[PDB]
Amino acid sequence: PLAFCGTENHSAAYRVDQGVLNNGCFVDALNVVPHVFLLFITFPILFIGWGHHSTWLHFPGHNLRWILTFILLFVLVCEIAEGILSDGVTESRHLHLYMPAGMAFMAAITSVVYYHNIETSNFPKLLIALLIYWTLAFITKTIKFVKFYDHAIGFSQLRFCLTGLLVILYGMLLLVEVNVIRVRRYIFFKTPRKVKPPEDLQDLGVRFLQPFVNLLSKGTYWWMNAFIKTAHKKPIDLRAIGKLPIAMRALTNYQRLCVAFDAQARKDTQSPQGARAIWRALCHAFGRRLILSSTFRILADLLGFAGPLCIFGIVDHLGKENHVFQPKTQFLGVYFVSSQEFLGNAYVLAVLLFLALLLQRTFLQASYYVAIETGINLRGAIQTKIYNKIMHLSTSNLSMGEMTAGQICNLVAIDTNQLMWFFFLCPNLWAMPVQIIVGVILLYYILGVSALIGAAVIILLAPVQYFVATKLSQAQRSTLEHSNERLKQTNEMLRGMKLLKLYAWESIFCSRVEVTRRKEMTSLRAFAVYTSISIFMNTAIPIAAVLITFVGHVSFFKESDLSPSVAFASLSLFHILVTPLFLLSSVVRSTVKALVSVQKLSEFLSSAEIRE
Amino acid sequence: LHQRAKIPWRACTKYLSSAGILLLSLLVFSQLLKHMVLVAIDYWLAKWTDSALVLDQSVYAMVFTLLCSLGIVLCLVTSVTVEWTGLKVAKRLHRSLLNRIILAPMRFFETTPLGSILNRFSSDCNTIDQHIPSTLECLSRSTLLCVSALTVISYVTPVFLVALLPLAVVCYFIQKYFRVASRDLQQLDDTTQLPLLSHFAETVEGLTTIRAFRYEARFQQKLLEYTDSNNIASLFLTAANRWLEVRMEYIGACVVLIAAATSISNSLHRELSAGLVGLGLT
Amino acid sequence: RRARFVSKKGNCNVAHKNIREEGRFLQDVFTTLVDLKWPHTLLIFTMSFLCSWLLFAMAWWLIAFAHGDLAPSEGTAEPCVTSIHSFSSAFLFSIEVQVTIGFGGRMVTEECPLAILILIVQNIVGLMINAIMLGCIFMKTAQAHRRAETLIFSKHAVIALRHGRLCFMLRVGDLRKSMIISATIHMQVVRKTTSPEGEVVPLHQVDIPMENGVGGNSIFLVAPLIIYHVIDANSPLYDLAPSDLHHHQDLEIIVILEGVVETTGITTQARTSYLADEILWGQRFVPIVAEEDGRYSVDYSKFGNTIKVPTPLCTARQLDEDHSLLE
Amino acid sequence: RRARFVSKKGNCNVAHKNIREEGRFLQDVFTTLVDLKWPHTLLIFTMSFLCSWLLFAMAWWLIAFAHGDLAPSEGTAEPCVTSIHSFSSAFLFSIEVQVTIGFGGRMVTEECPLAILILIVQNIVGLMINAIMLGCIFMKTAQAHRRAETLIFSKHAVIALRHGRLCFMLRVGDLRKSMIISATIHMQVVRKTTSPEGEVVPLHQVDIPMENGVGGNSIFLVAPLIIYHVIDANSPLYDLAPSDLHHHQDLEIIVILEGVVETTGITTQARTSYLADEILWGQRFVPIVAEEDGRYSVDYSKFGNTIKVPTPLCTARQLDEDHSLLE
């Protein structure tokens, strides 16, 4: 049957005479304690609460403890993986290697749910259970770490490193709970500090509840479930779409931009509304959120390479013939898997790949959302700035012809939109160089100089895409001119259609409209040719790169022999590198259009005004 | 509500039928054959690497070169074919619309607004001429790539189909709910963009009258309301997009976990080669 | 469209939004525990018992390991608890001590005092949580909300001329032989009313007097009796024309029956509502009681049947003005 | 300064001095035992169980010594209770008999009848004190004082002109779906009043009538509804000027909500107070109920929001005199 310490030497691991605290599976059993206690207290509270509208608030250290518990879940998955991996040699199953870590994983998820239900109901006096749990878990993990150090367990064995990480994480979560005690004094202080939920959350009519939901609900967009399920029932109107939160409003973003502009105008007075001043004002207004999006994007770019690396490790392990795994280090009759042979197992590399993709794609979507939200806030602030300039400009410059209604109209329509779309693609500006450089370096280390040749050919996609995009844009410009002429003729024909019916003058007008249509088709043929060239290059350059890198590796260079691990890791690296290389040209064109748009907006804001 | 959530199957059928049997048949054949050739390229890479693991290497290199060249040629063929199809459909459809509008009675012009007739020739013709070819190519290529990838990862691991069925059901529900929500949000976004630009035009061409009435603050508040409506429409649309993308990436994470675990189990002690699990992983 | 304040079955349809909960919903934890539906309550209590058993099983297993009772002993040591060989033995023993079955194959000995302390703690908390569950479902067994479902109101209320004056009439009955002691009825007119000063209240409830001989609100409900409110000069329904009795008219008349059950001695409340379309004009309830074979018999098949009676199709204020014209 | 009769949360701030207790506070011992806060009650009951266990452990140990069962013996005699070797065995045995676990390693035999008598006495008092604790915390589990905390009153009461007459208005709401059956509201004006004969009473409470259609005190509380008292010619607030609404004015208006809980069937009472500064003049409560998507929705974020309304800044007696001048 199942034994906690295992049935070895007539169950000699259950012998405790040498010292109860230095017996390895007793402190491993002591570890189980706090998790069982936490489940015992927290389950009836959650189950009772699971059997209106609350306008929840957030405790201090909310984001910090969500991040800490995500890291804790990752480390506990690693603990379960190494515990299962380290008893694959003994005949008896040692439950104490992974079952305490599994109950720790369940207790961590339970702690997150229990904290969420405490935080929503705003009853911080139930955080005593979390405080006791973090205290007990930290104490038992410290006992495990200290006994490991007393039994000559070093950093060569992974379990020591993981339990040290567990000690640090439990201490950090305990510090977070004590900080919740300190800020909101729900215990030991005579009067607790009452905190009201945010005023925009209490507004019945604010339904973009992204800044107010928890960190997991921010990353997974779980608040959209009710909105989309309701949208299936009934169509979305301007009422089902709520009101903007105060953080994202045109008045708020405009006032923030005005504060930034005043701070810039105090410094340099030669040109307070030049392109440099506007760029520095935009940086001062939205730079923290821009670098937050860039941080998420860079972390996603680095974690995306866990795909090819775990593929390389998995296929390298599966390509090993007659593999006989047996961990060399054994302490107290209990095997310990080292870090080198931990990451050499295909199953744990698959699990780490699953977790790495789960974190990485969430980070990528978070970067996308933050960039989009700041672009929209910038668009609102810039439109308010342009309209405030409209209220003061003299009509004499409107009379002189240097401005028209159409110029300001397209300054809002396409120029503000171009600046907004640049702020959409702004983290790409340094994300794509980082991802491309790290991908080429990993290609060199995985495959060799043949991967450098293939990477050069796949890097050649960006200049040819830039050239084809330029030709495509000018072809559609010619198409736009001919289409405007055709719409002019069609509008005149449709308005004079009564007279045309009277005089039977249709087909003669059809001939002219079709002549303009034929010339537009001659332009559109070149437009479609360049579109086809773009599509063919995008879908054929990776094939050519893969072909040349593998054929040159096996034929020209005659390097180390091709293996499925290196070949498929390189193929995954090319599949990762193709998309940023394709969108790099679009990002560069967006940056150039942003520079032109900011210059045009500066020339509008630096114009004549009526006197006060 | 039923017509709102309904995909325009008849419109797509008429759009594709205007291309002709020869061109549409060539398009379908080229797309299917090109994706089969790509699958053949990656499968031959797997067999090539298995042969090098056990180790006619020049024969393997020649076959890989032939397959890659065929794939490049077929990529050129399908790009040229889809753009040609778009051009031909655009030309025929505009000619037919112009002739039928010309033959219409004068009562149709008297009763129906000019905007309804002209918006076709202006916006819908522009969409059919330029956006529909590229969107059709992208949808066809993405659908065929997804189907071929699911077929490959089900070929290396036949047990993946058992987990593929519930993931397919969940993905279908996700995409249906996203499609209805996203259609409503996109239409609302454009309809909120329109009065903001109209307000800008109206304020510019009537600025002296506005400032004479001391109505600057009221018009600024009107602009704030308009751009707040546009901003909240844009924010809900991008939130729906991120919802869909997070769900699809989590489905892909489950797919790669199941494929990895089953392929590792089949490769360790069920005589599956390392190249095939690497193929399924990519 | 046309949201109603209370449904026909007595359910209140008000949605409550932006409720700053300060823990007050779960500080009243026993009210929640009684208020959970029966499968939920059974799940809570079996989960609490199982969690207590597992926690003290972990405690007993930990003590037995720390004393060395899990190893094959030399034969001299005496266990803290006899015959604890694994976690299964500790779980069976924890069940035995907490439910006080006490098979005695595994029993606490006098060797380690920590086992005695854990025995004391487990017995105390076992009696405590057994008492908590016992009291919670004694309150739950005594709930009279299911006794409120067998108090029926007529689906249609009627406005008919009674004693030369308009009366808003409804019928309420009781299906069980058990009396409802001190049966009181409160009736309201729920309607959005605008004050002369411009104060607009959306759900203004005006208590209308039930017509009674003693001028109060107390009924003796054995047989289904007609509850009627006399539309006099100071009544919310004074200007209620026959044309106002349509679906999209802002008018709802809620009726609240209250009283204690003769069996449990616990106050229960039954209620219903009548929208403007649900109120019938020119009709009155059919006689429902008959004297058959030496007893008064109630035929509940005719509980809500109304007979169309010729009544003046004008409101009671116009009746007062017209009667003063005739007089 | 400015002591208030009842706080905003319903706590009564009266200090009681020179109370000749004649044991009447502890003769009602079960009311005290229910009234102790939960950790105190748990401490009392675990201490009572432990004291009973220790007392009968002393009894069993004394009997076992007096029979000679504590001295080691070869085996001719049989013990009153088997395997009682020390006071620890007697304590474990007392726990076993009182909690009725009965492991059976130590059991009463038929040798000495004093052990049988002590077994009878211990079983009787164990059932007795188990019953006492059980009933006490069944009353404690049924306490509705925590249900009174989720009945909210507006922080500010308002005096506004309603139907051409001054009205002292406040808003009361309920946060839970559970109804409060037979909800009655009593309102008082607590003020030091001097009689014309010279009688000075410090905390004179005058019941002011809540304005109702039936002329009584009964509310149907689902949505938060405005409770208002009409300031007529015979009312304590008849001469209440706007200038009198300051902090150091001798005026407090307490409001007492009462009713039974639908769940437990137990009468609860919620209350609050309004000092003169807490009463606002020229304001009235904003509309709190809206009809959203086929239901009546209550936005509790606007529970106590008031809008400054132009009302005459003079007392209601001056309104009556001035209106008679205008008429």
Ligand SMILES: COc1ccc(Cl)cc1C(=O)NCCc1ccc(S(=O)(=O)NC(=O)NC2CCCCC2)cc1
């Ligand atoms: C899909 O992106 C990328 C893919 C690959 C790479 Cl290497 C970079 C990017 C990238 O730089 N992406 C960030 C910027 C971005 C833009 C659009 C979208 S989106 O989801 O397709 N569309 C919307 O959200 N549009 C909203 C709707 C309202 C008006 C405009 C905003 C998502 C993200």
Ligand SMILES: Nc1ncnc2c1ncn2[C@@H]1O[C@H](COP(=O)(O)OP(=O)(O)OP(=O)(O)O)[C@@H](O)[C@H]1O
């Ligand atoms: N200081 C006090 N504390 C508590 N109860 C009191 C006090 N003074 C009087 N009582 C109660 O009031 C009642 C008697 O009324 P009264 O105030 O006239 O007192 P008494 O005549 O002095 O008292 P007693 O009847 O006990 O001699 C009794 O119920 C008594 O218990």
Ligand SMILES: Nc1ncnc2c1ncn2[C@@H]1O[C@H](COP(=O)(O)OP(=O)(O)OP(=O)(O)O)[C@@H](O)[C@H]1O
């Ligand atoms: N949204 C709400 N949800 C629940 N209770 C509320 C809400 N708003 C106010 N209350 C309750 O109303 C009372 C206070 O009345 P009022 O409506 O004036 O609120 P307040 O003065 O803003 O609140 P507080 O006294 O907590 O600062 C308190 O009992 C408070 O709990």
